[PDB]
Amino acid sequence: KEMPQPKTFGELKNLPLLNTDKPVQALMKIADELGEIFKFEAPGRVTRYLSSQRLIKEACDESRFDKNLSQALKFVRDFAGDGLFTSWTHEKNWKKAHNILLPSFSQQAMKGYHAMMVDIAVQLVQKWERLNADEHIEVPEDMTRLTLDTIGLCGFNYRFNSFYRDQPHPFITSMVRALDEAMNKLQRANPDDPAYDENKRQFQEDIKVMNDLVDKIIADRKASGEQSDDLLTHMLNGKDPETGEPLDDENIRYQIITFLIAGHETTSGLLSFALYFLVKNPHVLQKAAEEAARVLVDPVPSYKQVKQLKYVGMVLNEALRLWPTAPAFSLYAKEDTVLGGEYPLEKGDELMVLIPQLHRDKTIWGDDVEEFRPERFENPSAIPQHAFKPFGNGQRACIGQQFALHEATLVLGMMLKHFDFEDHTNYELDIKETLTLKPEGFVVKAKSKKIPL
Numbered sequence: 001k002e003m004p005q006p007k008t009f010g011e012l013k014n015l016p017l018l019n020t021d022k023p024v025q026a027l028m029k030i031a032d033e034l035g036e037i038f039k040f041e042a043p044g045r046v047t048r049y050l051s052s053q054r055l056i057k058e059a060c061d062e063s064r065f066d067k068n069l070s071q072a073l074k075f076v077r078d079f080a081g082d083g084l085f086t087s088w089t090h091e092k093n094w095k096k097a098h099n100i101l102l103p104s105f106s107q108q109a110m111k112g113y114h115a116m117m118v119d120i121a122v123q124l125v126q127k128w129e130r131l132n133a134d135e136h137i138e139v140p141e142d143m144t145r146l147t148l149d150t151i152g153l154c155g156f157n158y159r160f161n162s163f164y165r166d167q168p169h170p171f172i173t174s175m176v177r178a179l180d181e182a183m184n185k186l187q188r189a190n191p192d193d194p195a196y197d198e199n200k201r202q203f204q205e206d207i208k209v210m211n212d213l214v215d216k217i218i219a220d221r222k223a224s225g226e227q228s229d230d231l232l233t234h235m236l237n238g239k240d241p242e243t244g245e246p247l248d249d250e251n252i253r254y255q256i257i258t259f260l261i262a263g264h265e266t267t268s269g270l271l272s273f274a275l276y277f278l279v280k281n282p283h284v285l286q287k288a289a290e291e292a293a294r295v296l297v298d299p300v301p302s303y304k305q306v307k308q309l310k311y312v313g314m315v316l317n318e319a320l321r322l323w324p325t326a327p328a329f330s331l332y333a334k335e336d337t338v339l340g341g342e343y344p345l346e347k348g349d350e351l352m353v354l355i356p357q358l359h360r361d362k363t364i365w366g367d368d369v370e371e372f373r374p375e376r377f378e379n380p381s382a383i384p385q386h387a388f389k390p391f392g393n394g395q396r397a398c399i400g401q402q403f404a405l406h407e408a409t410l411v412l413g414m415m416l417k418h419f420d421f422e423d424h425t426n427y428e429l430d431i432k433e434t435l436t437l438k439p440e441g442f443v444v445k446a447k448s449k450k451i452p453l
């Protein structure tokens with residue numbers, strides 16, 4: 001038996017299949033054709049793409065597999081360094097930072113961020129309240145304004161002031177370019193070829209821009225009168241219980257970059273996909289809006305009120321089921337092992353978890369997997385182990401999950417309280433890929449229900 005494998009291109013093997021602006025969606029189509037596992041080869045390189053809960057539950061066994069840095073993350077690492085997202089589990093700075101930063105996502109920490117999330121959310125609601133009758137909303141663009149500003153303010157007491165800008169913040173444009181450069185480094189035979197000299201200068205330029213802003217954040221804090229108690233406070237002061245050490249300056253810098261990027265992009269995607277699915281499913285929108293009106297009785301939502309937005313949470317999880325905005329993660333075999341009783345693996349062999357395919361596993365979810373039905377999440381405990389993995393796995397799972405979900409629930413709740421939404425262009429879903437996923441060109445009209453803040 002040979003493991004299923006998609007079409008090859010001679011000595012380039014499968015590599016040309018990733019020569020596309022939508023590689024994840026291409027891989028999903030391949031997964032549909034070949035099933036729960038396929039081999040993917042390139043010159044000097046191999047991985048295996050997993051799509052079924054049957055195989056992914058084994059892959060999520062931390063005694064057998066550990067987080068691997070995919071080739072994309074290896075290039076992200078050139079500017080994210082040994083930050084949490086791009087560090088190996090066995091690097092000293094992973095476990096230190098993990099221990100040091102987990103308290104920044106405690107219950108008491110989340111209550112502490114609430115007021116500043118509301119600040120940015122109110123700015124969003126006011127922007128939309130202030131639009132003229134003709135005008136429309138550019139959804140992913142405004143969601144990115146919100147999520148970037150929220151992480152900036154909550155995490156670093158720094159105001160990006162994205163709602164004061166027509167263009168995206170220069171950080172965003174550099175970040176997008178740097179992440180695209182990482183996605184396109186995958187294809188290049190002979191990386192040191194003189195033809196790619198300008199891309200390396202452009203890459204060093206974009207990194208410079210992100211790093212310049214990290215300096216501005218550091219200096220703002222250094223010469224600050226106020227006494228914060230946020231993510232940066234913990235990076236600067238906090239001590240790891242195990243080693244007894246704090247993070248050094250080089251690592252703190254990497255953590256800031258990491259949190260700025262990981263701390264907004266996927267969350268903007270989530271809010272965009274959620275609103276997309278709501279406007280395409282009006283009965284679901286109505287149910288979510290009824291909850292928002294019932295629960296959000298005060299002009300400013302409370303922490304407790306956001307926690308009571310059960311259905312809005314269900315809407316968000318269902319959006320994550322269909323379009324998990326960080327759609328893959330990578331694993332390597334810790335020792336020789338046999339996957340599924342059928343596929344033998346040697347130490348160091350790599351796996352890719354194709355999350356959107358896991359989330360369409362019919363043996364877990366039933367036959368209607370393409371339908372947007374938030375009621376699937378009525379009781380989240382009903383979902384089998386390792387069936388729903390939009391925040392990854394185990395000790396290497398998303399540290400910011402609860403942050404992302406609180407922000408998204410708050411903002412979507414406020415959006416549904418304050419506005420009726422019109423899919424005025426009958427938008428055809430078009431998913432842009434930049435490692436992460438977004439509905440490009442998604443636009444709506446928002447008719448104010450006229451409720452004061």
Ligand code: HEM
Pocket residue numbers: 067084085098151258259262263264266267270324325326328329330390391392393395396397398399400401403404
């Ligand atoms: C919808 C929103 C989000 C999604 C879908 C998401 C998804 C993920 C996924 C899949 C991973 C695992 C990556 C891998 O195994 O290679 C991860 C890790 C991480 N996420 Fe998120 N994330 C989100 C929001 C956030 C936010 C808001 C923050 C920070 C404020 C954040 C910070 C991180 C960090 C630091 C890690 C690395 C954790 C570690 O390995 O120690 N994420 N996230």
Ligand SMILES: O=C(CCCCC1CCCCC1)N[C@@H](Cc1c[nH]c2ccccc12)C(=O)O
Pocket residue numbers: 015018023024040041042045046047069070071072073186187326327328329352435436
């Ligand atoms: O799976 C891919 C291509 C899609 C990228 C998905 C993103 C990964 C980071 C988190 C968000 C989603 N690439 C893999 C595997 C791979 C298979 N053949 C290859 C040849 C050359 C380079 C990579 C590669 C990866 O990046 O390792």
